[PDB]
Symmetry: C3
């Protein structure tokens, strides 16, 4: 159903959804590569506190990239320059018992741009939900190690100051990769990232990289001071 449309204002109101939905359709007249600052926040209000957080001010570009990895890709039309379908459940849709509601908020929107949010209903119900988390670096240290066990997909920022990325697998082996090799391996599973309205296809964003994590327990970043490196990890778990 048509959840909301936003135009003119720089911040969407607290959008409330009561019926069970499983996926969100985000449409805009701004291209995917032109998203700069817009952020989204989605949660489920269970009652007297103890609400479930699925996304806390996650960047829209990272949210779109982390959800359209694989056979699918972002779409375009003659009326909308960017369409993306992002799922929130594994197979069916979120189940709300008595008074739970899904609250969605948009922040840092552009004044002269239009956005539209739609919700997709499903005939099934499920308790397996997707969770988004954010990790960063202090930007004043050369190297840092993070643990990515459980997560099956990551979106990393791309900068010229990142030298090495070390993957530590579940069997103890450690493999070092360069950004070029990382991008080449990334573009081997999902060759196409988006299709433009005119007909051209873009096979990758110039400053974001999608990494699938299979049997990977650790990621080490070897970089140089001067920039902040951001990772957005996606996981699936039962609430």
């Amino acid at each position: 159903m048509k959840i909301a449309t936003i135009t003119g204002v720089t911040k969407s109101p607290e959008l409330q959804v009561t019926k069970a939905i499983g996926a969100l359709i985000l449409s805009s007249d701004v291209a995917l590569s032109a998203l700069t600052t817009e952020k989204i926040s989605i949660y489920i209000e269970r009652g007297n506190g103890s609400n479930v957080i699925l996304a806390n001010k996650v960047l829209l570009k990272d949210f779109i990239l982390a959800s359209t990895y694989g056979t699918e890709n972002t779409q375009s039309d003659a009326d909308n320059a960017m369409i993306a379908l992002c799922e929130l459940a594994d197979e069916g849709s979120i189940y709300l018992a008595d008074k739970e509601s899904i609250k969605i908020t948009l922040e840092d929107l552009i004044s002269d741009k239009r956005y539209d949010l739609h919700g997709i209903e499903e005939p099934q119900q499920t308790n397996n939900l997707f969770f988004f988390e954010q990790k960063s670096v202090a930007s004043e240290e050369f190297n840092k190690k993070i643990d990515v066990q459980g997560f099956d997909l990551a979106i990393m920022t791309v900068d010229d100051s990142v030298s090495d990325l070390s993957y530590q697998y579940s069997n103890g082996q450690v493999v070092k990769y360069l950004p070029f090799e990382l991008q080449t391996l990334s573009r081997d599973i999902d060759p196409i990232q988006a299709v433009l309205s005119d007909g051209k296809v873009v096979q990758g964003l110039t400053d974001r990289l999608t990494l699938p994590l299979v049997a990977v327990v650790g990621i080490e970043i070897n970089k140089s001071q001067g920039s902040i490196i951001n990772f957005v990890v996606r996981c699936l778990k039962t609430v």
Copy 2:
């Protein structure tokens, strides 16, 4: 093997094939979007018995869109502006027992256009065949309900007067869809519909929508007066 090449005339003769073929190849110098009124009729003729009707004056555009949904698509070359492969059986060629033949007819052709036909045979014989059926919703009526039990793929005409499309599933649940949401969901399975000669790709047709039906038993169309809504459904069964 090559079947026929048609030019100049507006009606192809009733071509007869005796070799057991498994699929057809349709090639023409007009793009897939440029097809307007061409119709195809394919059936199996038995010398002593009842005819087997697969397609009866089915639109060529709908036939191609039904047969080329999935990983594949319709391609193009320098000589031919449209090349498509259409499957007739499930995983083999149609088996002719005693006095069976395949009759193919093309009608409502354009005078100055070329239409070729090719046949593809397989080393296996199977009894599963694909059947095409046509359904309509009139223009003087507001809403309708059509039973789509047993089918797995439909193609609906696209008009600016359709309001809602409702799916009733096998478990009794009812889900309402907007045309925009339905198009977005349809493109979520097959991102690309055709590739042009220059290099640009077209991800859909402006007046056709392909609906993959899974465990759906009813479709309810809600619209306003002004146009006729046409559905072409495909099914698989044994003869």
Copy 3:
């Protein structure tokens, strides 16, 4: 890791690799369709037994097209006009015990172009290796029958002299195809062959055709005298 960067010379020096790499990355500023005479040669020198010859002066175009069939395809970036990822092992990497090492060389390059080699390692080791072989049909031979049992992919040069090509399957059936039908069948598996820098995709080469051999035990070529035909076949086996 980075193996070598070749620029200015017409023959790359012999390169020795000691680490157990799993795949190679070929990057160059020459488009995929623009390669004419570049050749590669890879072989493993083993201190216990006999040396393993993987590629013996295989053309770069055929070597690249043999590895990028399926969902993957050769890509491009701003700096590099052609990037390809070619696997040398089935799932893991080549096993080297104590001193056995891989040796790679490039031949018949162009002085005013650029080439690079990258190596990709894997956390696992395997003995299943990929082998490339070359078959030839002379100019004075009207027809020729070859045994492609055990192979899984072939690359042929499209020529106007070739008239028919017949598959012989395991069950004994023989099916004859034309070049047009062969190309159409091939393009139904991998619709897109490469993506250029400006966003236009290319769905195939104008002089090379890729044939997937599934349950095929013989290939017969019928042509007219005048031209030579070359097949590049790929196979997987345990050493």
